[PDB]
Design a protein around this ligand. Structure first.
Ligand SMILES: Cc1cc(/C=C/C#N)cc(C)c1Nc1ccnc(Nc2ccc(C#N)cc2)n1
Lengths: 552, 401
């Protein structure tokens, strides 16, 4: 059928005219296929023969359908598409299973010839004109235009979905207890009715759909739960990811590893603790895709843990709108966070992992706070609600960091949970200069054209020193100079620098870094008992700055 | 009768995607919108409108209000609401002892919007978990939050205010977006009486806080007045002055630096010399006054930077070129993001009153954190533009109090 629903008005982009593309010659047998097919379609109303006036045209062709002996009709809508207006994005956003509510019974209905069942804006049909070529392209071809949504035209996905949504609205309005999801040409329908009345509601809906031009599978042809959908296995009362088989191989290609990382990342939505750090380091660099990468020790072991976590089926539950959500986060290892979200411990609605560096230097308290933020946004999308958090950090630790850190922050209601490793601050810089502690005036420098650097210090106790560095930068020498003061100093030390760069880094209390220097400087700060760090304007001629500026 | 509106030449409507909203806002947004729909202010739209702007709900009291983020539309119509017909900013407003701010946005709902412009005001009400299609709408009338609405209604507004302006020649009334600003030097009781008199005129046309800009003074860079001075203290001092040296003509440091002689212990106490105690004072008096040589340039964007000072204090500067401060200030007294959200609104309010313009904000926060939370605390009808920055640690203390 062709739905009786009203059409969506459409037009070409503002300056443009419709397509005028020449139909190329086709082989005789493709010409025969097209004639039979367009004859079928024409008798269904799908297309109409058009007069000589219509100046627009769009090429067409025919292909032998799969491994069968029927043909398909393909239209090339490139030109028309480039000239057609933009539409509302079909709809961007897929429901996550963990957001779905438990259902007693669920059914899938398959919409027949979806696109060809919806009418095309009458004013627009003329621009869909196409021509079936005569043999050897000797005589004028048979010309047609579409009356329905062509397959392949820019606007069909969006006008179809809108048409369905509009058709469904009465049904939804008279059936609020019932749940329906539109994806492409599929409808899924959930109820908390028993098999009997549910089957009855499905028929009223089919009748309603057929009243509107849309044919569906009979009570016999509707697929059974559990369904595969978007990589998921849905059951009425639980959900999981669809089967994931990790291959047994002696040799892993770059392509094998990427795909393995992909499946593992996918499974981590519901399999707790999946890790891919070690496998991911392998992907590092830049081989060819067919290149073999021997697994490291810590990668072959990582595969081991994962293969274990997966050996047994795991499902997530569905969302109860009446209850709070609880999110728990653990530090796995090196910048790797994992988390679980549940309403009844420990039946997870879903799990996940967070592993991102924001900047070259951070600390566990920053990273934890970022995972919290990532999880909060995710909860808003999936449930429209923020979770209550349980975090491996003491309220005192987090309150110490937040207050004295210069960036603003905030995380929703949370409370301490003792799941080691606990996140902590590994050292605190002093807030006032230290008495009885040597003052190191440090300074580092680099000649831009040489890549040569000197780094050094003078102290109030008269200690002095300079070390030469090669291929270094200004930024590096300033960090080396502070590193030097740290190595040569006692457990308490004041350090005066003119590098805002160095001060920024260290004052942020990093506990890990991409820089070897900074990692050492950090290792050094853990050892100290008290470090006070001070900044001074360079070259302003300051008592101690001037001194070690003359040496380096 | 509608006024023809068009975008800036070449460019296309906004296609800004809707943010995730909580269950509650979505609920409130549906209620509100079905009501606006049967009053004809908005109409449902089809997929042939590809445009979008974000929407959300605020409670300013407990009453949900709809707020549409027209920053992109506004940017994309900007020639229209500024340089065709536009609203003049009176310089006397910032001088008044009392300015009252009144919401008159509800007046726009009585004016038809140019039919061919309507499609650009498209917005979407999302569903949770994307389980059903968003509810899409267009405006039929002048929308709140769009900078075109007061431009178009301006003609009706002066007519409405004409009697009251005639009867009170010394009161300044300024419109910006959905608000009226009303200033006088009347004693506060009589100022209020006049605000009420004003509301009564407004009420005959379909419209139902107090600032004291006069009492705004800059927050100088503060120079400590130490009982006793250490090397550490004197080095801080020099840095602060060093930095001020690039804003304020005449700042001097050379005497003080002389006190930093050789390589001393940070904690060593040092006597302040005759010439040093003199700079100190000279620089304070300079720091007390406005920056000589800095001026507001009408063609340039205003920028506003905010630093977290801890303990609930926040410092800020307004400038067009870095370090050329038009205005500095602080704002005081829980939740970091709540305080920041409040400080932004306050600063935007002063900025509108002073220049008739909102600043582009540099916010000391993580994009993600701000975006999750700010709508929880927003109480204003506009939204300024903003970006996110890591405060250079020094800048923070140089502005500390
Ligand atoms: C988004 C969605 C995807 C599918 C996708 C179907 C497929 N394939 C099926 C339905 C019915 C829905 N819509 C909603 C809305 C609210 N709760 C639920 N719960 C729910 C849905 C399916 C199963 C099952 N089995 C269990 C509970 N579904």
């Amino acid at each position: 059928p062709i739905s009786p629903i009203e059409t969506v008005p459409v037009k070409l982009k503002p300056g443009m005219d419709g397509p005028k593309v020449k139909q190329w010659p086709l082989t005789e047998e493709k010409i025969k296929a097209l004639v039979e097919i367009c004859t079928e379609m024409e008798k269904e109303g799908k297309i109409s023969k058009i007069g000589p006036e219509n100046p627009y045209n769009t090429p067409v062709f025919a292909i032998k359908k799969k491994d069968s002996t029927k043909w398909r009709k393909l239209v090339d809508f490139r030109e028309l598409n480039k000239r057609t207006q933009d539409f509302w994005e079909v709809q961007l956003g897929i429901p996550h299973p963990a957001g779905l509510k438990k259902k007693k019974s669920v059914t899938v209905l398959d919409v027949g010839d979806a696109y060809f069942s919806v009418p095309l804006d009458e004013d627009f049909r003329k621009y869909t004109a196409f021509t079936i070529p005569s043999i050897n392209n000797e005589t004028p071809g048979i010309r047609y235009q579409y009356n329905v949504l062509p397959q392949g035209w820019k606007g069909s996905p969006a006008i179809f979905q809108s048409s369905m949504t509009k058709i469904l609205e009465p049904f939804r309005k008279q059936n609020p207890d019932i749940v329906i999801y539109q994806y492409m040409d599929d409808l899924y329908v959930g109820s908390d009715l028993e098999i009997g009345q549910h089957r009855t509601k499905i028929e009223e809906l089919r009748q309603h759909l057929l009243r509107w031009g849309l044919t569906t599978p009979d009570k016999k042809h509707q697929k059974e739960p559990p369904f595969l959908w978007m990589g998921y296995e849905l059951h009425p009362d639980k959900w999981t990811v669809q089967p994931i088989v990790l291959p047994e191989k002696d040799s892993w290609t770059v392509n094998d590893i990427q795909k393995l990382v992909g499946k593992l990342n996918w499974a981590s939505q519901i399999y707790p603790g999946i890790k891919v750090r070690q496998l991911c380091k392998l992907l590092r660099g830049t081989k060819a895709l067919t290149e073999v990468i021997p697994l490291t020790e810590e990668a072959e072991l990582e595969l081991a843990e994962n293969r274990e976590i997966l050996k047994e089926p795991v499902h997530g539950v569905y969302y109860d709108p009446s209850k709070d959500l609880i999110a728990e986060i653990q530090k796995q290892g090196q910048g790797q966070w994992t988390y679980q979200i549940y309403q009844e411990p420990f039946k997870n609605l879903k799990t996940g992992k967070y592993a991102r560096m924001r900047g070259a230097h951070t600390n566990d308290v920053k990273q934890l706070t970022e995972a919290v933020q990532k999880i909060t946004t995710e909860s808003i999308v999936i449930w429209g609600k923020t979770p209550k958090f349980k975090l491996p950090i003491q309220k005192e630790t987090w309150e110490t960091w937040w207050t004295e850190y210069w960036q603003a922050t905030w995380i929703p209601e949370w409370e301490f949970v003792n799941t080691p490793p606990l996140v902590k601050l590994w050292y605190q810089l002093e807030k006032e200069p230290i008495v009885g502690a040597e003052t190191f005036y440090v300074d580092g420098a680099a000649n831009r054209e040489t890549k040569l650097g000197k780094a050094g210090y003078v102290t109030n106790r008269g200690r002095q020193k300079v070390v030469t560095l090669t291929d270094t930068t200004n930024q590096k020498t300033e960090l080396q100079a502070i590193y030097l003061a740290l190595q040569d100093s006692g457990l308490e030390v004041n350090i005066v620098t003119d590098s805002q760069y160095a001060l920024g880094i260290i004052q942020a209390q990093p506990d890990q870094s991409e820089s070897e220097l900074v990692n050492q400087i950090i290792e050094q700060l853990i050892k100290k008992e008290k470090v006070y760090l001070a900044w001074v304007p360079a070259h302003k001629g300051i008592g101690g700055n001037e001194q070690v500026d003359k040496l380096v | 009768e509608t006024v023809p509106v068009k975008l800036k030449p070449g460019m296309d409507g906004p296609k800004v995607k809707q943010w995730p909203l909580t269950e509650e806002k979505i609920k409130a947004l549906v209620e509100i919108c079905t009501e606006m729909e049967k009053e004809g202010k908005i109409s449902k739209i089809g997929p042939e409108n590809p445009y979008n702007t974000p929407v959300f709900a605020i409670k300013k009291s407990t009453k949900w209000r709809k707020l549409v983020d027209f920053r992109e539309l506004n940017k994309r119509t900007q020639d229209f609401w500024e340089v065709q017909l536009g609203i003049p900013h009176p310089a006397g407003l910032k001088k008044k002892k009392s300015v009252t701010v009144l919401d008159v946005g509800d007046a726009y709902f009585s004016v038809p919007l140019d039919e061919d412009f309507r499609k650009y005001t498209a917005f979407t009400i999302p569903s949770i978990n994307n389980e059903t299609p968003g509810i899409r709408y267009q405006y039929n009338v002048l929308p709140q939050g769009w900078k075109g609405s007061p431009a178009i209604f301006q003609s009706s507004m002066t007519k409405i205010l004409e009697p009251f302006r005639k009867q009170n020649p010394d009161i300044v009334i300024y419109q910006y977006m959905d608000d009226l600003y009303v200033g006088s030097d009347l004693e506060i009781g009589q100022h209020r009486t006049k605000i009420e008199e004003l509301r009564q005129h407004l009420l005959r046309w379909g419209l139902t806080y107090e600032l004291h800009p006069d009492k705004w003074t800059v927050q100088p860079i503060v120079l400590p007045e130490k009982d006793s001075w250490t090397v550490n203290d004197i080095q801080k001092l020099v840095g602060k002055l060093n930095w001020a040296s690039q804003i304020y003509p005449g700042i001097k440091v050379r005497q003080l630096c002389k006190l930093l002689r050789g390589t001393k212990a940070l904690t060593e106490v040092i006597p302040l010399t005759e010439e040093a105690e003199l700079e100190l004072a000279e620089n304070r008096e300079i720091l007390k006054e406005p920056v000589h040589g800095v001026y507001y340039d009408p063609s340039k964007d205003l920028i506003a930077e905010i630093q977290k000072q801890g303990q609930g204090q926040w410092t800020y500067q307004i400038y067009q070129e870095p370090f050329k401060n038009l205005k500095t200030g602080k704002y005081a007294r829980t939740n970091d993001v709540k305080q920041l959200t409040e400080a932004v609104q306050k600063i935007t309010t002063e900025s509108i009153v002073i220049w008739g313009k909102t600043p582009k904000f540099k916010l000391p926060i993580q994009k993600e954190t701000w975006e999750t939370w700010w709508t929880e605390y927003w109480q204003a009808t506009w939204i300024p533009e903003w970006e996110f920055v890591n405060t250079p640690p020094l800048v923070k203390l140089w502005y500390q109090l």
